[model samples]
Target: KGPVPFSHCLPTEKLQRCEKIGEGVFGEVFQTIADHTPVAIKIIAIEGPDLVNGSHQKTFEEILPEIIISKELSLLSGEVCNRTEGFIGLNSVHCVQGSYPPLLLKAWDHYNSTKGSANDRPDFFKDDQLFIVLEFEFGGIDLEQMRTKLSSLATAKSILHQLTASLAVAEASLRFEHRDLHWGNVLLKKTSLKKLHYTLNGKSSTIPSCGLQVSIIDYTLSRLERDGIVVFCDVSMDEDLFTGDGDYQFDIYRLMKKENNNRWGEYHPYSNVLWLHYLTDKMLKQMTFKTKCNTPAMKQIKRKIQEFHRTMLNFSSATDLLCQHSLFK
Candidate 1:
């Protein structure tokens, strides 16, 4: 996908009430409070000569795989061969080539004073620079932030179940591997409906949503093969994560490295199961889910988390686990 004309793209000024919300390693995200559906627009810096913030910005070619993968997963939100609404909803995508416009740069001031920023200022980007604007439906707070607050074991079950079903469908349909399914990457939005939808191997199924919608995001290290086109990154080149001395989030990377034998381009659904195990651990140890809530229904939730913790990697892939494991049963 090459750069589209900025005129053809969503105009930078049309974004109403745009404010800086978050950042990926690649770029910054701003949420706009439009009259209609709320939006989180991730404006990524790309194809620039000078390092914007001391790191080489991604080129259009290098960033294409993620753009493809992101859109494909977002497509799963609607009816498809193997689909689930569990992934982040991508409203639109654009390749807007221009200066970080006036309205947008001011959002930086508000974000800088109110929230503070890590990357160097955006004004450095030249007028000719290209950006990939991803317009997404705002998925609510990540599980890491809501970890201590979600006191019900049912919520934990819902998150795990929703995420598991999604991964299973992707694994079966696309040979997909998220590669990085950390708690921060899992967004739980509040919803009224308790029943969620999924399609695996062209068969339909309903999973319990438990008044929460799970959206899997940030496919930076993701791998998927579609119609003979393999889309993935060489994480071996990105060596920083492996050296971390932090919690099991860091441990998960080391485990993935060993499981894949440092080969990241290949599809090893084992990697998905590994992150599933990591997520289950977070549900058990970090999140203080109560046993008393939703009593009879949640009676097995804690036990399921414990069991998943014990034997998550016992299966070959998420697809295998969804079919044979007792956790979802």
Candidate 2:
């Protein structure tokens, strides 16, 4: 689809602007309302040089990478939404174009700090600066934030179950690898349902009674696999292989050994299993720290957590091994 018209970006006729809820590398995200329905809009600045001598400036080429990435993510997001029956991933509604000078200037300043200042700023920066308006479903807090304050073991179990199930579907059905799976990227939406439903063996079922729904977001670094192989042909050769920098990171885990010989980690769904193990460990530790109870129920939950930890530690390359684990069952 062509770029969405600025007028259609938001339901302006019915919706009223609420408050900004987040800001990131892409843009600022705002929470808005229409007929009491909550919606989130991410406003991204379209950066480039000015049109010079009545011709498009060459600097616009820099924006092409972002445009391509956004389109790719949009397609993947739409496909996941359709395949998962709206149970996972972002529910993107529109990709609108607009201009907001103040925000653009602020974005420019931020970019300049890192990428060096632009010598020839666009003359239309005041009125013609373009923006990409991404409208999506809102109303969930990230799991990182919830871990500190969450007290109910049942709710935590539900959220974890949904998250794991969603990742399983993504890997098996879509051959999708998030690459950047972490607590911060996992969102939890509190629902009235006590248990979350998922598909298994082409059938739907529910378990682990709780009230939270899971959604994965931030697909900037995700990749798709086909025929047991991840295609990187379209990706630039210069792109970094790893997903993140510093101590915290996510990506293929290469193995080094003398017996079987060293080899790069193959792209398999079990890689995600390893990452989930790390995440679950962190989550359980935080939950234990936050919870002050020593009741029988809490002890039982702790024992379960330990068991899950042991299972994850013992698993190898067999994806089915994880599927058979009590955590998913």
Candidate 3:
């Protein structure tokens, strides 16, 4: 007897890779177009020599992580049993108005002024594949791009709200954790404001605008605890096998010898700080949410900015201490 395949597993025959999207430590990701829908297909080599002929085989370790992440996301999407509760099934539910109501409003305000004519709303349903099929994004811009267009603090807060909503859905409902929460994984789409046309007597009236849609993607680094228990709630920001050299000696030599090699090398303690700052600034700059003269909203934005700053500061300090005193020291 054969083992039962997971419910989320799709037949390989149905998925066809059309183009290579990108590559990472784990594997090469391709755009798989199946049934007129596009999905990301990550291809990894399992059996290959460490050094074939002369070149080194550095992509094997990525296979397990990819499978683990995919399996976790798949389980969460189907584990739900109630509709009123969160963790709604993988299927998308269309709201009469729009998705992410408030944030959508900000997105609409930002994009309507510039690309008012862009109508690239993404579909909501995700066809089952080997990994988790996230809710379809309306468009292709990531967080970094959006922040550049709208650089206001308010927009950042709204964007954070949308991101937290998605995270909450995954954490509370799905029991999953996004191991990697960097900017590249976050995606944004252009959505139009909902306008209702009503006719009364002989006069026709058009309702005003609504909001925009925001989506988070790239679950390749996500994880879910087994048996619905929080086995690991915290993720250490340690370099993986790909980045850390084998036998730990290589890692030590690189840090000690090359610590002062680059511009950041001058300030070893602040190198990690600058990196965090760069990502934070990029995140802030890529926001597309437009806010009016709302004092309360602005305050919330300010608070979030402060929180992010403090959080990153702590991370930076921790990195500096770990670098200076860890086993590498």
Candidate 4:
């Protein structure tokens, strides 16, 4: 028998596109609900012959790596020895064979009128347009969008702690490297929980939540080695990713390329260290935090960031750094 239709997987009756949350060269993203659970859907066009906004659309072969990397990382949330909910969980993947759904079009229109999107309209797609519907756990807003929420030093420390712990666990278990971890890729949400749990080096550990939970998203450039299989995106072929500047983040990309020797297949945990440096720089220089400078706790947190920044590159990876002394602690 052939595969089930897109209608069967994403029943139009149940799907309600609430609004467009994000858009990039990959495709548009929508917030929707299904089976009473909130979901973030990234709709990517596939198999289109024409170039889409100066970039070619992904074929099945091209999209598999992203799916594989994301699925594997998301599964780490439940694994025994190394687990953390820091990664945005993928609920499902659907290869939809049809035009953009009408509900999504309406949602997109609202976003276009408000946020003013730069991507093409979904209605322009053909009736037989192929789409990769990546349904993910709605991980709240990204760091860039939550500027006012990050007003406390404790909150910032908690974010760094949570992110480092998750990356440590993944590095130990999967040799995972999130090659591109700009601030936008880090999602932050409010929570009632007092602490977040993770397992590192076969020991269960907990870190302060500080009224916030962190989730890392977007593995477009993630690298992982799992069960004798290596999954990576060879960013070396893309010259543009290495030559950009406006923030400290742009330099991290160039730094990563040099560290990897332009070979992405090989494992380089230091690239993870490079991104941590980039994140710290943002927290220090760019973040519109409300934490006052006079508070002792806030001052100490800034000092901690400055100290870590000076000698951060010495650590081989996030795992190595954590094994020494968790800066948050």
Give the whole-model CA lDDT for all candidates, comma-separated. 0.81, 0.52, 0.38, 0.83
Q: Per-residue lDDT tens digits of candidate 4, residues 143-259?
A: 888867676666777888888888999899899999889998999888999999999978998989998899999888888997768998877789789789788888988898888
Q: Which candidate has the top score in lDDT?
A: 4
What is the Å distance of residue 98 in model 3 from its true position?
A: 44
Where does candidate 3 stray beyond 4 Å? 1-17, 50-65, 74-139, 145-147, 150-154, 192-214, 218-221, 228-282, 285-304, 307-329
lDDT of 2 by residue, 262-320 (tens): 22223445556665666667666665445544799877776776687678746542235
Full candidate order by lDDT, most accurate first: 4, 1, 2, 3
lDDT of candidate 1 over 158-272, digit per residue (tens): 7888888999988877889998898988998888986988888888888887788889988778899988779987878677889887678889899989988898877789988
> In order, what is each prediction's RMSD in angstroms?
2.4, 7.3, 16.5, 1.6
Q: How much is the lDDT of residue 286 in candidate 1?
A: 85
How do these models rank on TM-score, best leading? 4, 1, 2, 3
Candidate 4: stretches off by over 4 Å:
1-6
List candidate 2 segments past 4 Å from native: 1-5, 11-15, 46-95, 101-130, 225-247, 250-267, 287-290, 313-322
Model 3, position 140: C-alpha lDDT score: 48
Question: Candidate 3's residue-wise lDDT over 1-329, tens digit each?
Answer: 32112212224443223333433443333344456665554433223343322333333243344445444444443343311111112222111111212322343344445644232221221222122223231234556555545535654544443444344434433344444445656554444745323222223333322333444455443445545443221213333422655333234323422443522112233323333344455554434446533588676656666666555444433223223322112
What TM-score does candidate 3 reach? 0.45
Displacement of residue 112 (Cα, Å) in model 2 is 18
lDDT of residue 158 for candidate 3: 42
Point to the candidate with the largest TM-score. Answer: 4
